[PDB]
């Protein structure tokens, strides 16, 4: 979720 | 930027580059051509990068397996020696350096890994691998390590992995099956399991590389090592009383070293082709030419009939070749570099404890086959915009596991935003946008800015 919003901003 | 009227040769570091340089000096004042030998790091990946843009060396020296890859990229010029020259070398060693029927390199010598032991520290060498743990705690008492070899390269650890059941690609109907990779079967696990057992018991350091294990054997600190014929000259300098012998056998099965044929390929972008040819044919591949290199670092069994008759009687070549007989010759297909890297990863991760064998090997399977991971195989099918006239972006996945189905080029693809209740993935009312680009590749970046 949180480590996945961070991912999705970069990705 | 690779000039004319001079020869620049690239050989591996551990090989006889100094002996080759002596052949260079002989050639230098025989025709009038400057021959210089370089030995750079990661040479086998440097070449397909520098030469690919017209600027490599004239000649490159590597094991026959890498050449298949290069050949495909057309970095190597195809060599045509008259059939009368091909008689000097053994007929089968020419197959090693054949790709699409084209002869691409000159076979120089055959090297396979052999178990080198210390006759003084250990009088009688171990027949099996299972007895090494037993025969280490014995030597550890007397302030010595039993077995030490380069754990950093797969070429060294693979014989053990291969011993029980492991293999690269299955040879089926005079060819190699690229989907069938046996880097992760029952036998491959048993091999890597027991290898970790040696690390997670302090029998062998998972750090150990080349020069570490190399120096230690020469100082007289380790009982056994696993190395190639090139290694022998440093063991001579140090004056250790040593013996080259057959590798130990794991689970009754003999260890299966992948066997390389050292080869010399001519750079396609080079203008000095015929110059190189006359060097290799007339100067290098001859009794004195091979003697010089062998004087520097032993070549193993050479491919040159005339000189091999001589080398044959050396008891150390006997053991080298006896090891090669138990193992297999390397494939020279391009998928090999994938395989090699696939294993380097696995062995490294398993050694450090980063992964359990089964995990490291499953990834190795994925890597060598070059397929999707178990998690992602379901993207393969997808192509919700298809029967395509023209360029396409093939079904791929991104770094979150969002399938991007096969799309025609120059089109904006839309897929629902992922969301996560802990691990559990689901789809929102929102959309992730990604462009399948005009040239046929997915845009590097996925615009996920709407899933909040
Ligand atoms: O370790 C994987 C590596 O193995 C082979 O390279 C060997 C080479 O054949 C030997 O002559 C010696 O120099 O050691 C090399 C690696 O330590 C493969 O040819 C190569 O593709 C692969 O990277």
How far is the C-alpha of B169 from the C-alpha of B336, rounded, in Å? Answer: 9
Asked if residue B20 lies in contact with residue B37, where contact means CB atoms within 8 angstroms, the answer is yes
B83-91: list long-range contacts, CB under 8 Å, 24+ apart.
B85/B281, B87/B305, B88/B285, B88/B304, B88/B305, B88/B306, B89/B285, B89/B303, B89/B304, B89/B305, B90/B303, B90/B305, B90/B308
Resolution of this structure in Å: 3.4
Does the domain formed by B112-259+332-369 have CATH 3.40.190.10?
A: yes
Give one word for B370, left, alpha or beta, with left for phi > 0 and alpha for psi -120 to 50: left
Asked if residue B418 lies in contact with residue B402, where contact means CB atoms within 8 angstroms, the answer is yes
Q: Which two tokens stand for residue B16?
A: 């006889």
- The residue contributing the CA closest to ligand 1 atom 22 is B340
Kindly give the pairing relationship between strand B105-111 and strand B301-302. Answer: antiparallel
If one residue of B153, B348, B364 were mutated to test the ligand 1 pocket, choosing by the most ligand atoms within 8 A of its CB, it would be B153
Ligand 1 centroid, distance to B412 Cα (angstroms): 44
**CA-to-CA dists, residue B341 to B5, B64, B152, B368, angstroms:** 37, 17, 11, 8
Nearest residue in chain B measured CA to CA from A7: B400
Instruction: Determine if ligand 1 sits within 6 Å of the CB of residue B339.
Output: no
Beta bridge partners, B436, equal B411, B442
Asked if residue B231 lies in contact with residue B12, where contact means CB atoms within 8 angstroms, the answer is no
CATH node for B1-111+260-331 = 3.40.190.10
CB atoms inside a 10 Å sphere around CB B372:
16
Query: Is A11 an interface residue toward B (CB < 8 Å)?
Result: yes
Nearest of B106, B125, B150 to residue B279 by alpha carbon = B106
Please enumerate in sequence order all residues whose Cβ is within 8 A of that of B227, keeping only pairs 6 or more positions apart, or say none: B113, B114, B116, B149, B150, B214
How far is the C-alpha of B112 from the C-alpha of B96, rounded, in Å? Answer: 14
Q: Give contacts of B449 with chain A, Cβ < 8 Å.
A: 9
Q: Please name the helix (run of DSSP H) or strand (run of DSSP E) that holds residue B375, with its range, or none.
A: none
Query: Residue B347 in 3-state DSSP?
Result: helix
Determine, for residues A11 and B448 on separate chains, whether the beta-carbon distance falls below 8 Å: yes
Determine, for residues B448 and A4 on separate chains, whether the beta-carbon distance falls below 8 Å: no
Please enumerate in sequence order all residues whose Cβ is within 8 A of that of B372, keeping only pairs 6 or more positions apart, or say none: B366, B379, B380, B397
Kindly report, as residue ranges, where domains of CATH 3.40.190.10 are found in chain B: 1-111+260-331, 112-259+332-369
Half-sphere exposure of B326 (CA within 13 A, CB side): 25
If one residue of B17, B63, B66 were mutated to test the ligand 1 pocket, choosing by the most ligand atoms within 8 A of its CB, it would be B63
Beta strands in B320-406 (DSSP E): 328-329, 392-393, 396-397, 403-404
- Burial letters for B341-361: b for 16+ Cβ neighbours within 10 Å, e otherwise? ebbbbbbbbbbeeebebeebb
**Nearest chain B CA: its distance from A1 CA (Å):** 6
Q: Please name the helix (run of DSSP H) or strand (run of DSSP E) that holds residue B164, with its range, or none.
A: helix B154-164
Please enumerate in sequence order all residues whose Cβ is within 8 A of that of A10, keeping only pairs 6 or more positions apart, or say none: none
Secondary structure in 3-state letters for B13-40 = CCCCHHHHHHHHHHHHHHHCCEEEEECC
Query: Residue B165 in 3-state DSSP?
Result: coil
Q: Give contacts of B445 with chain A, Cβ < 8 Å.
A: 11
**Nearest chain B CA: its distance from A8 CA (Å):** 6
Instruction: Determine if ligand 1 sits within 6 Å of the CB of residue B155.
Output: yes
Nearest of B353, B165, B327 to residue B260 by alpha carbon = B327
Nearest of B227, B215, B232, B211 to residue B298 by alpha carbon = B232
- The CATH architecture annotation of domain B370-452 reads Irregular (4.10)
Nearest of B8, B3, B5 to residue B37 by alpha carbon = B8
Asked if residue B176 lies in contact with residue B333, where contact means CB atoms within 8 angstroms, the answer is yes
Kindly report, as residue ranges, where domains of CATH 4.10.1240.10 are found in chain B: 370-452
Asked if residue B377 lies in contact with residue B396, where contact means CB atoms within 8 angstroms, the answer is no
How far is the C-alpha of B430 from the C-alpha of B420, rounded, in Å? Answer: 14
Query: Is B246 an interface residue toward A (CB < 8 Å)?
Result: no
């Amino acid at each position: 979720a949180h480590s996945n919003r961070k991912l999705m901003e970069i990705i | 930027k690779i000039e004319e009227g001079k020869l620049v040769i690239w050989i591996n570091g551990d090989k006889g580059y100094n002996g080759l340089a002596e052949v260079g000096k002989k050639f230098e004042k025989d025709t009038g051509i400057k021959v210089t030998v370089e030995h750079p790091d990661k040479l086998e990946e440097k070449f397909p990068q520098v030469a690919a843009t017209g600027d490599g060396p004239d000649i490159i020296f590597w094991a026959h397996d890498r050449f298949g890859g290069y050949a495909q990229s057309g970095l190597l010029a195809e060599i045509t020696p008259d059939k009368a020259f091909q008689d000097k070398l053994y007929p089968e060693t020419w197959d090693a350096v054949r790709y699409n029927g084209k002869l691409i390199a000159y076979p120089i010598a055959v090297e396979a890994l052999s178990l080198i032991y210390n006759k003084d520290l250990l009088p009688n060498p171990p027949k099996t691998w299972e007895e090494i743990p037993a025969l280490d705690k014995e030597l550890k008492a007397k302030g010595k390590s039993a077995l030490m070899f380069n754990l950093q390269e797969p070429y060294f650890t693979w014989p053990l992995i291969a011993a029980d059941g492991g293999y690269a690609f299955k040879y089926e109907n005079g060819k190699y099956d690229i989907k069938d990779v046996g880097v992760d079967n029952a036998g491959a696990k048993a091999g890597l399991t027991f290898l970790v057992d040696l690390i997670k018991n302090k029998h062998m350091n998972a750090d150990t590389d080349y020069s570490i294990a190399e120096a230690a054997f020469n100082k007289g600190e380790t009982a056994m090592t696993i190395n190639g014929p090139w290694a022998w000259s440093n063991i001579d300098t140090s004056k250790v009383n040593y013996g080259v012998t057959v590798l130990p056998t794991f689970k009754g099965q003999p260890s299966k070293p992948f066997v390389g044929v050292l080869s010399a390929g001519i750079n396609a972008a080079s203008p000095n082709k015929e110059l190189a040819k006359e060097f290799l044919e007339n100067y290098l591949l001859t009794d004195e030419g091979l003697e010089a290199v062998n004087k520097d670092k032993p070549l193993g069994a050479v491919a040159l009939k005339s000189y091999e008759e001589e080398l044959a009687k050396d008891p150390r070549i006997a053991a080298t070749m006896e090891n090669a007989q138990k193992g297999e010759i390397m494939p020279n297909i391009p998928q090999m570099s994938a395989f090699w890297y696939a294993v380097r990863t696995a062995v490294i991760n398993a050694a450090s404890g980063r992964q359990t064998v089964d995990e490291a090997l499953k990834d190795a399977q994925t890597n060598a086959a070059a397929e999707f991971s178990l998690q992602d195989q379901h993207c393969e099918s997808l192509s919700l915009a298809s029967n395509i006239s023209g360029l396409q972006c093939n079904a791929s996945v991104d770094l979150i596991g969002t399938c991007w189905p096969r799309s025609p080029a120059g089109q904006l693809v839309v897929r629902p935003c992922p969301a996560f209740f802990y691990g559990v993935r689901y789809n929102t009312t929102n959309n992730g946008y990604r462009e399948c680009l005009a040239n046929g590749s997915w845009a590097a970046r996925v615009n996920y800015s709407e899933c909040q």
